[PDB]
Each structure stands twice: as structure tokens, then as C-alpha cells.
Symmetry: C3
Subunit: 243 residues, 3 copies
Amino acid sequence: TPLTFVLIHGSWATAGFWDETASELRKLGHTVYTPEYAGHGADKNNNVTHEQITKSVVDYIKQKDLKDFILLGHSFGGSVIQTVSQQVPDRIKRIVFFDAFAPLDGQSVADQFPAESLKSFEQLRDASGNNTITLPFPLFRDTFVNTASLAQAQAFYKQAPPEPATPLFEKLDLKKFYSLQIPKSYLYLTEDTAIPQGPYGFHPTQSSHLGVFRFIEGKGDHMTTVRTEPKMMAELMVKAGRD
Amino acid sequence: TPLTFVLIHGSWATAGFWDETASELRKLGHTVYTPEYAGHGADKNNNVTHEQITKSVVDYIKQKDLKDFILLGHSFGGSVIQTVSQQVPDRIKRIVFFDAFAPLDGQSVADQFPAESLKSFEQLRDASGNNTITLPFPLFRDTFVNTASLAQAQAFYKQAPPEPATPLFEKLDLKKFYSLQIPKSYLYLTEDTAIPQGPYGFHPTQSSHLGVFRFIEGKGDHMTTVRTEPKMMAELMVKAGRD
Amino acid sequence: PLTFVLIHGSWATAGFWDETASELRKLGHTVYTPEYAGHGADKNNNVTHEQITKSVVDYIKQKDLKDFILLGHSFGGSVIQTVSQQVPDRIKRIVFFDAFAPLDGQSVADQFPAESLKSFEQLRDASGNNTITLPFPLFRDTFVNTASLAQAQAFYKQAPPEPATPLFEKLDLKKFYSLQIPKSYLYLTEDTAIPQGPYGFHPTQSSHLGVFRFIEGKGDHMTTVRTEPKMMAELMVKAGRD
């Protein structure tokens, strides 16, 4: 039966992250929205806050008056789907975390990282002199697009803009999110190393934050597979999103 | 080489759990027994004990004089293959744990769960007023049959009867099992979340209780895959059961 | 086109790579599979880690190899560590394939669960000639768990007893841990030669590398390089390529 998806990209990404996978979901007959949000894409605001990002997504949903949809977030987008779901819970059928962070109440996204990764991100933020984090291409190539060829890694890095740092480090009040009875799914790709696998990995550590959820597993990494295997990704998003 | 399997279902299930997969094993030339056990199937006994279940399976094995067989258990059935193997060790070629619990000596099946799940099962047992646990459908749909469609999930839920609770909470004496020299295997499906993945999960946590064993991995979940992909499951059970 | 130097582990010879090396060459890559001290033809049950390391360095220098991918399996992960710190100018990338990566001042045996360490010390001592012969049941269910019995019996005959000293020697790896050469870890998800859990190849051994490229495949410790060499060659290119 037809589904409506609202897809929320994460850091070092734009709404164009979803171009190939959103096309394949539409070919299955689903309706797909891929909003851009504050401080990202064409909105230049290196001092953007988590609440400004959240407001930009809630305003997009309200302006289209969307109801009964699957809210899906990737990476830092997991924190966005949590804060958006607190504001429009009546509109959401299911919340899907796709290789996404799920901070606990009183935590930031940065709080999810191992000590060495936290240090690296603070250093990148401070090096910029403009409150942004530019991923080094060697780190990107070997931990974000590990399964890509070099030519693919270089093409995808062109679409990985510097990230405004404030929303990664803000502590979030997620008491409302953790009270919601909306069903949750976690869609995990087994080569995703954007956060190192082990005690801090996306799965089972981040996914376990959701409590009861529907686990769907696939093959891929953080940023290659939505471009290279969009049919398979569309099918996994349906398996995670469907009733 | 042809194999003889004795397949032991787990909780919220009957011998009918094995219908499709047993049929595919028989097409490969294997002999397959799927006994029912005390307080399950048509045998109504809300107060059944682990000893009564174990004796019903031992009596089935003795009455058919079964020997040189692969004793395979799913879920709670792992505890039953342990206690059965204590009484008929000379009859068993290999013991296969398929997404199954393997309590240590002095532990129950319920002891293997995270604290939150254990409390939830105690609450369901108490709410029944008749010593049974009925899985709620949202929990079942999202954590027992997470890879199924909703229509499949509903069909499988209709085949998941309430479970007599005593055997899940009894402490088991398993000293004999842990002294046995019989070869073991663990067959794991990587989307099985009937116990949450993480520190309490089926693999590597439950499987590690076996000590030295043969690990075999497949794709699937707790209760969909034996119905939807029975040929693939039969092949996995041969890979886990063969010499 | 890539150049690979493949380093086998314990209970193996350079012939471990025959099938996978052939498939890599059909993809257009150049592939070297050196033998090392105390393994293959070289009968030396008292060989040391330094002797093994020097035999591989000597091979690389004599052939004047450069700009190559240095890949090790199992105990061979310790060998690519010690080799790479001698010839870092020659190496493009270091690939650990279901391999040990001891930290500085550790041995390979230090990676093992306590009960495995005691067992290996006992097998070494029982030999009377400083070798370790794996018992066939342990081999059959934990090294070639995905093989048939007939395949396991054939592979066991190609698994010679291991000279024990290099497994137990502590390694000076300060230079290896200071290198900026990129690292990859190639992991097969049914590899149980060290049990999965806190002691497993991935994420425990792989975590020792710091930042690395993770590539995952399907297979076990010693079956898959024989039975699925085309797939293993593809994974080695995914792990080794720029």
C-alpha cells in the first residue's frame, strides 16, 4: 500500500543526498519529500542552532500540511527526527532511524562519540575559525564511503559540505520524544563506520537507545550505498517504514 | 550424507512452527521429527513445568528409539535440548542451538533477558491471572517478525499461542549438560531481535555460553524466515548439523 | 592495476593464497605470495618473529618492490606490522584480513582468551619439538566451520604444525603505531578462529588500528580463500584500492 516518506539528511550532506534513493522509492509508488533545513544546502548560517533546524523542518511539514507519514533520519538527522517528532507527533505514522544517532535525554550528538572522535571534532570546529567542521577527505574516504571507489568517493565528497558545529554539541531535552508511543525502526548497514563499530557503533549501541524498535539490516556504508544501490535502499526503507 | 533431525520449538509456538522447513529438509533426503511437548499444542496445562516438558521429549525419543540424531532447538527450545541431552546423551550426534537460549547452570530462560524485558514478562504473567504470557502484537510484530509484512505478521501472530509461564522462570540444573562431550553448533540469523541485540543478544552472548561450537550465520528473524524461506533454512540447518 | 604482497598466517604456507592470488591476477593485479622463515620448505621449529620478519623484508628488498599493498591473514597481521615498520617508504596501504593486530609490547598469544592461551602453551609443551598441532575437532568447527567434513579433512592436511616461538614473543610496534600509511581491515562474518565476542577479530582486533577502512564479507578463517576465491579477490581490491 502507498507510503509517504519525509527524509531528513544528516551532517556533511544536503537534501540531494536522497536524489537516487528518493527516485527509486517514487518508482515503487511512494510519495517522498526531501526537505532542506537551516544552515544546510543553500542556507548559509554557520551559527545555526538545533532549534532553528527543527523549526525549518516543522515549518516545511506544516506548510504542506503532511499527515500519516514515515519520518526517516540519517546520521545527525536522527536527532532532528527526535526533536521534530516532539512538535508534530500527531502527524507521524512511524519514525525510522537509518544509521542515525539517537541521543538520550540531556545528551548531544557529540556525546555519542568515543573520546578520540569527540576530540577530533572539537579540533576541526576550532581549526575553522568560523564554527564549522570540514571532514578531512582521507577520513571521509575510509570511514564514510569505505565501500566506494576513489572516483565515487571524490564525487560524493563534492556533495559533503562543511557542517555548522553548534547543533552537534547542544544538549537536547528529549523527555517528550522518549514518552511518545509512535513506533520506531532502525535501518542499519553493516559496513557503516562513520562512528567506529564497537561499543559506540550505530548498532547495537545507538539503536538500543530506542528501546523497542523494528530492526532492518542491509549491506552498505554511511554515504556510498544511497547513491550506488538506490533500488535496494528504497526496498529496505519500505521494510523499515511499512506497517 | 542423510541426517536425522529432532526439532524442538520454543515458546509462543507449537510443533507446526517447523511445517515448511521440515518439509524442505525431507526433500533433501533427511529424516525429521517435530515432537509436541507438555503444555503446548493441544496439551492444556498452564501449570506445566520444565521437568514435565523435558520428560515428554525424552519419552518421545525413547518410544521411537531414536538415535544418532541432530537435536535442534529454537528459542526456549534451547533450554529443552540442554535438559533432554542430560538424560539421553548416548543418542545424540550433535546439538544445534538455532536462535536459542543456552542458560548456564543455575539460571532460567527469563534470566537471559535485559532487566526491562524480564520485568515486562513478569508483568504479563501476573496480568494473565492464569500463569500465561501473551505477547502483545506490537512487540511481536516489531521484534519477533520484524522482516515480515503486516499481513504475514498477523498470520504468524494467530499461530503464537499464550505461553505457560513456569518453565521460563525455573532455575535449571545444567551441570551434566556442561560436562557433555557432544559437538555443538549455533545457527544465528542476523535480524533476530526476539531478545534485543547487544550485551544480552543471541550471538555472541547466548552462543558464547556453549564454549567451543560451530557457528553458522544466515539472514532472517525469529519467526518469519522458517515460514517464508524454508529451503534456505533447511540448507542452513544441514550446514549446522552435518559432520 | 595494484600490486599486492600477501602474508599467510599460522598452520599455513604461501600456498594458502594459490586460488585467491590466481583470481587477483585475472583482475589485472600483480600478486606476490612469499614464503617466510620456518614455514613451507624451511624446517625450523625454533624460528623467531625477527627471523620471519627479516625473511619478508629481504624478499621485498631483493625484488625492489614498491608502492604495494601489504596484506596479512591471521598471525600474518603481526608480520605486516613488523615488516611495515622496516620498509614504510615502499608501502601504499596495509590490509589486515581476519588478522591479529597486537598493541605495542604484546604478542599474538596475548590476543587469545585465557583458556586458549593455556591450551596453546600445553600443545607447545606436549609436542616435545616447540610446535603446535591444532586438534582436528577444534580446527573443523572453529577454523573451517563453513566447510564440509571432506573439505575440512583436505584443508587440515594442508595445515602443518606451527613453530611456537613467534606466537608468544612480545613485539616492539612503536614505529608501526606512529605510521601514517593507511590501514584497512577485511573481516569475514563467520570467522571464529578466535571466538566472536570480546576477543573477536572485529571489532576487537580491528579497533587496535585506530582509523581504518572496514570491508566486510561472508566466510570463515580458512575455507573461503579456497572455495570463493573470486569473491575474496574482489574484497581484497575493495580493501586495498586507493
